[PDB]
Design an enzyme around this catalytic site. Structure first.
Site, PDB file in Angstrom:
ATOM      1  N   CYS A 253      18.018 113.848  17.471  1.00  0.00           N
ATOM      2  CA  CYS A 253      16.948 112.928  17.863  1.00  0.00           C
ATOM      3  C   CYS A 253      17.398 112.047  19.027  1.00  0.00           C
ATOM      4  O   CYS A 253      18.561 111.647  19.113  1.00  0.00           O
ATOM      5  CB  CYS A 253      16.513 112.075  16.661  1.00  0.00           C
TER       6      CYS A 253
ATOM      7  N   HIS B 191      12.929 104.922  15.301  1.00  0.00           N
ATOM      8  CA  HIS B 191      13.291 105.089  13.893  1.00  0.00           C
ATOM      9  C   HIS B 191      14.795 104.990  13.652  1.00  0.00           C
ATOM     10  O   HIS B 191      15.230 105.123  12.502  1.00  0.00           O
ATOM     11  CB  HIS B 191      12.747 106.410  13.330  1.00  0.00           C
TER      12      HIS B 191
ATOM     13  N   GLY C   1      20.908 115.033  13.949  1.00  0.00           N
ATOM     14  CA  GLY C   1      21.617 114.286  14.964  1.00  0.00           C
ATOM     15  C   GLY C   1      21.093 114.477  16.367  1.00  0.00           C
ATOM     16  O   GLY C   1      21.564 113.798  17.287  1.00  0.00           O
TER      17      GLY C   1
HETATM   18  C1  LIG Z   1      13.566 122.852   7.305  1.00  0.00           C
HETATM   19  N1  LIG Z   1      13.213 121.726   8.166  1.00  0.00           N
HETATM   20  C2  LIG Z   1      13.830 120.548   8.051  1.00  0.00           C
HETATM   21  O1  LIG Z   1      14.723 120.370   7.219  1.00  0.00           O
HETATM   22  C3  LIG Z   1      13.437 119.421   8.957  1.00  0.00           C
HETATM   23  C4  LIG Z   1      12.644 118.390   8.212  1.00  0.00           C
HETATM   24  C5  LIG Z   1      11.256 118.908   7.928  1.00  0.00           C
HETATM   25  C6  LIG Z   1      10.495 117.993   7.003  1.00  0.00           C
HETATM   26  C7  LIG Z   1       9.942 116.810   7.494  1.00  0.00           C
HETATM   27  C8  LIG Z   1       9.238 115.949   6.658  1.00  0.00           C
HETATM   28  C9  LIG Z   1       9.072 116.322   5.219  1.00  0.00           C
HETATM   29  C10 LIG Z   1       9.634 117.515   4.777  1.00  0.00           C
HETATM   30  C11 LIG Z   1      10.334 118.333   5.660  1.00  0.00           C
HETATM   31  N2  LIG Z   1      12.573 117.194   9.050  1.00  0.00           N
HETATM   32  C12 LIG Z   1      13.528 116.261   9.035  1.00  0.00           C
HETATM   33  O2  LIG Z   1      14.508 116.372   8.297  1.00  0.00           O
HETATM   34  C13 LIG Z   1      13.368 115.053   9.914  1.00  0.00           C
HETATM   35  C14 LIG Z   1      12.898 113.919   9.042  1.00  0.00           C
HETATM   36  C15 LIG Z   1      12.313 112.848   9.912  1.00  0.00           C
HETATM   37  C16 LIG Z   1      13.155 111.876  10.445  1.00  0.00           C
HETATM   38  C17 LIG Z   1      12.641 110.879  11.262  1.00  0.00           C
HETATM   39  C18 LIG Z   1      11.172 110.879  11.548  1.00  0.00           C
HETATM   40 CL1  LIG Z   1      10.472 109.658  12.556  1.00  0.00          CL
HETATM   41  C19 LIG Z   1      10.375 111.868  10.991  1.00  0.00           C
HETATM   42  C20 LIG Z   1      10.943 112.846  10.182  1.00  0.00           C
HETATM   43 CL2  LIG Z   1       9.924 114.070   9.506  1.00  0.00          CL
HETATM   44  N3  LIG Z   1      14.608 114.672  10.604  1.00  0.00           N
HETATM   45  C21 LIG Z   1      14.772 114.924  11.904  1.00  0.00           C
HETATM   46  O3  LIG Z   1      13.880 115.508  12.515  1.00  0.00           O
HETATM   47  C22 LIG Z   1      16.036 114.534  12.624  1.00  0.00           C
HETATM   48  N4  LIG Z   1      15.757 113.606  13.739  1.00  0.00           N
HETATM   49  C23 LIG Z   1      16.699 115.771  13.177  1.00  0.00           C
HETATM   50  C24 LIG Z   1      16.786 116.933  12.214  1.00  0.00           C
HETATM   51  C25 LIG Z   1      17.422 116.816  10.979  1.00  0.00           C
HETATM   52  C26 LIG Z   1      17.497 117.913  10.122  1.00  0.00           C
HETATM   53  C27 LIG Z   1      16.939 119.134  10.487  1.00  0.00           C
HETATM   54  C28 LIG Z   1      16.308 119.255  11.723  1.00  0.00           C
HETATM   55  C29 LIG Z   1      16.237 118.157  12.579  1.00  0.00           C
HETATM   56  C30 LIG Z   1      15.561 118.268  13.910  1.00  0.00           C
HETATM   57  N5  LIG Z   1      15.039 118.341  14.938  1.00  0.00           N
END
Ligand SMILES: CNC(=O)C[C@H](Cc1ccccc1)NC(=O)[C@@H](Cc1ccc(Cl)cc1Cl)NC(=O)[C@H](N)Cc1ccccc1C#N
Ligand SMILES: CNC(=O)C[C@H](Cc1ccccc1)NC(=O)[C@@H](Cc1ccc(Cl)cc1Cl)NC(=O)[C@H](N)Cc1ccccc1C#N
Lengths: 302, 302
Positions: B145, B41, B143
Site C-alpha cells: 500500500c 489508513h 506491505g
Molecule cells: C485474497 N485476498 C486478500 O487476502 C486481500 C484482502 C481481500 C479482502 C478485503 C476485505 C475483506 C475480505 C477480503 N484485502 C486485504 O487484506 C486488504 C485489507 C484492507 C486494508 C486497508 C483498506 Cl483501506 C482496505 C482493505 Cl480491504 N489489505 C491490503 O490491501 C493491503 N494494503 C495490502 C495487501 C495485503 C494482503 C494481501 C494483498 C494486499 C494487496 N494489495
C-alpha cells in the site's frame, strides 16, 4: 495477489547510460567507474559493416575520434581497447552514480530486465528471457544498440546482456558485457539465422506453480508421471528436456503448494495433449515460459 | 522491431519512495519536496479498519506519532493533514531527488507504470491499465500500500495512482495523488465489489495497428463497417462503445499504416465473431487491451 511480468527498478542502470559517437555512428554506452562499454561496431561505417576487420579498423582510430556524452556533459576519452565484441573507452571522470555491479554470463532460460535506450537516454524497461537458441524477443528500434540487460540482487546490479543487432526474423542478438555473443552470431551485417527455438520447460512449470499460488487449480489432475515418460511427451511438443536439476530447482515451489514436481508434470502433459479448451491460466491462453522459478518466488512470496 | 509491454524507467520515482510508520502499521510514502504522501489508513489499527472515522482518528495523532524513513535516514515530521484519502506529512527536509512532477487524475483505459514497493524499497516495475470498472489488475502483496503509478513526459513525472487495497476478487483499487478513489470504493476493510468489467475497444484497435506496423497482417480483410454497426457487435462481446473521438485518436496510426479506422474495425468484428483459429497476434492468443494509441506510437515510432 496477481501475477505480472515485472522488471527490476531501473534507476541504478539509468545513471550509467551514455551516448557514444564515432563519425556518423551513434549508439548507447554503459559508464561504470571511469570506463565506457559499448558495441565495437560503433567504429564501422556502413561500407565497413559488410565484412569488417575490427583490429584493422580500431588501429586507425585515436582517442579523439570518440565522442562520449553523459547528459549535456561531454566526457573526455583518454584510452581505448577492444575486448571481444565490446569497445572499452577509458574516460577522465569516474561515474559518481556507479552502482555496485558485476558482469555475469547467463544460461538460456534465465531472464533479465532490459533498459531500452536511444541516444544515451532511457525510454522503457521490460523483461526478457534468453531463448534456448540464444536470441531474445525484445523491442528495439534503430539507435537501441548498446542498451543493456540486467538483474539486481540486494543493490548489486548484475549486467548480463548488451544489445548488438536485430536478425532478419525480427529477434535480437547480443553479447555479455565482456563482448562474447550469446549463440553463434557475429557482429557483421550479413543475414544470420537463429536455430529453431524450443519452449523452456522448467519455466512453464514454475508459472503453473505461480498459478496455483494465485488460486488457479483447474488444470491439476490426480495423475503423476515419471521423468522419462514426461520427457518423451516434451520432445513431441518441442519442449526442452526436464533434468533432475530442474526438478530440484522447483523444490521450494513444490513445497509451498504441496504439489510434487512430477505431479505438476502430469498437468503439463495433459495441457499439451488436450489444450486449454477455452480456459486461461493467469490471464493467458498460451503456456508462458519467460518466468524462472526464481522470478515466481520473488513475486509470489508468502 | 518487436512489441513488448514496456514500463517507464523508474529511477525518478525510486528516489521518492519512503517508509511511513504509525504504531504497528507500516506502508510506503511518496516524498516530494518537503511533503510525504501516503494512504490515510496508516493511522488505523486493525480494529479501526472495520468502520473508521478518520477525522476522529487523526485529531488524536501528533507529529511524533509518525515515523518516516528514507533509506537509513529518519525524517522529522513537522506537520500533518488529510486531503481526502491521502495523508500529507510535512517533513523538515526537502527531497533533493525530487523530479519535475505533476499530479494527474486519469480516465479509464489509460495506462501507467507501477513501481511496486515494500517498506519504502522498490521491488519491481510493471504496466497497468485503469480498467473501465476503475480497478487495476496489478501484482501486490501485503506491505505494498502506498506504491504509486506514473507516466513520464519529457522528464516530468505525472503521478496518477496510489495503491490502497486489494478487493476480494484479487484486483486492486486506489486513489489519485490527491486522495480521491478511482471508482466507487472507500478505504475501509469491508468486502466491496467492482462492477462488471468490459474490454477497452480503442486500445484493442491500437494493438491491432501495432501488429500491422510489425508485419502481422493475417487478420485484415477487404471489408469496412460503419461506426454504428461496429458498436452493435461491440455490445454483444462486452466491448466498450467506440466513439468518434476514439476514431480521431487513432488517426496517426491509421495514417502510418494506410488502414482506415473503420476498416480495422471490420477486422476486429471478424476476429470477435470467428476467433483466431489457432493463430496469434504479436505473440498473443487473446486480444490485448492494455496498450493505448499513445503507447503504440511511443514504442513503434517509424
Ligand atoms: C485474497 N485476498 C486478500 O487476502 C486481500 C484482502 C481481500 C479482502 C478485503 C476485505 C475483506 C475480505 C477480503 N484485502 C486485504 O487484506 C486488504 C485489507 C484492507 C486494508 C486497508 C483498506 Cl483501506 C482496505 C482493505 Cl480491504 N489489505 C491490503 O490491501 C493491503 N494494503 C495490502 C495487501 C495485503 C494482503 C494481501 C494483498 C494486499 C494487496 N494489495
Ligand atoms: C526488418 N528488420 C530490420 O530491418 C533489422 C535488420 C535486419 C537485417 C539484418 C541483416 C541483413 C538484412 C536484414 N537489421 C539491422 O538493420 C541491423 C544491421 C546490423 C548492424 C550492426 C551489426 Cl553488428 C549487425 C547488423 Cl545485422 N541494425 C541494428 O540492429 C541496429 N543496431 C538497430 C536496429 C536498426 C534498425 C532496425 C532494428 C534495429 C534493432 N535492434
Amino acid at each position: 495477489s496477481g501475477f505480472r511480468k515485472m522488471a527490476f527498478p531501473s534507476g541504478k542502470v539509468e545513471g550509467c547510460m551514455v551516448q557514444v559517437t564515432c563519425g556518423t555512428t551513434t549508439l548507447n554506452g554503459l559508464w561504470l567507474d571511469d570506463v565506457v562499454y559499448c558495441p565495437r561496431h560503433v567504429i564501422c561505417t556502413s561500407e565497413d559493416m559488410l565484412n569488417p576487420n575490427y583490429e584493422d579498423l580500431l588501429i586507425r582510430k585515436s582517442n579523439h575520434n570518440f565522442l562520449v556524452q553523459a547528459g549535456n556533459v561531454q566526457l573526455r576519452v583518454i584510452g581505448h581497447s577492444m575486448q571481444n565484441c565490446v569497445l572499452k573507452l577509458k574516460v577522465d571522470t569516474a561515474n559518481p552514480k556507479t552502482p555496485k555491479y558485476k558482469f555475469v554470463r547467463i544460461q538460456p532460460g534465465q531472464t533479465f530486465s532490459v533498459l531500452a535506450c536511444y541516444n544515451g537516454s532511457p525510454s522503457g524497461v521490460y523483461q526478457c528471457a534468453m531463448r534456448p537458441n540464444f536470441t531474445i524477443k525484445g523491442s528495439f528500434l534503430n539507435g537501441s544498440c548498446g542498451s543493456v540487460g540486467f538483474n539486481i540482487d540486494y543493490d548489486c546490479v548484475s549486467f548480463c546482456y548488451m544489445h548488438h543487432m536485430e536478425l532478419p526474423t525480427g529477434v535480437h542478438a547480443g553479447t555479455d558485457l565482456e563482448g562474447n555473443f550469446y549463440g553463434p552470431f557475429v557482429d557483421r551485417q550479413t543475414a544470420q539465422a537463429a536455430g529453431t527455438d524450443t519452449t523452456i520447460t522448467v519455466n512453464v512449470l514454475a508459472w503453473l506453480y505461480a498459478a496455483v499460488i494465485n488460486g488457479d487449480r483447474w488444470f491439476l489432475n490426480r495423475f503423476t508421471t515419471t521423468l522419462n515418460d514426461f520427457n518423451l511427451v516434451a520432445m513431441k511438443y518441442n519442449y526442452e528436456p526436464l533434468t533432475q536439476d530442474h526438478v530440484d530447482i522447483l523444490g521450494p515451489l513444490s513445497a509451498q503448494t504441496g504439489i510434487a514436481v512430477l505431479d505438476m508434470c502430469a498437468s503439463l502433459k495433459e495441457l499439451l495433449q488436450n489444450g486449454m479448451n477455452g480456459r486461461t491460466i493467469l490471464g493467458s491462453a498460451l503456456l508462458e515460459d519467460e518466468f524462472t522459478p526464481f522470478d515466481v518466488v520473488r513475486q509470489c512470496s508468502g
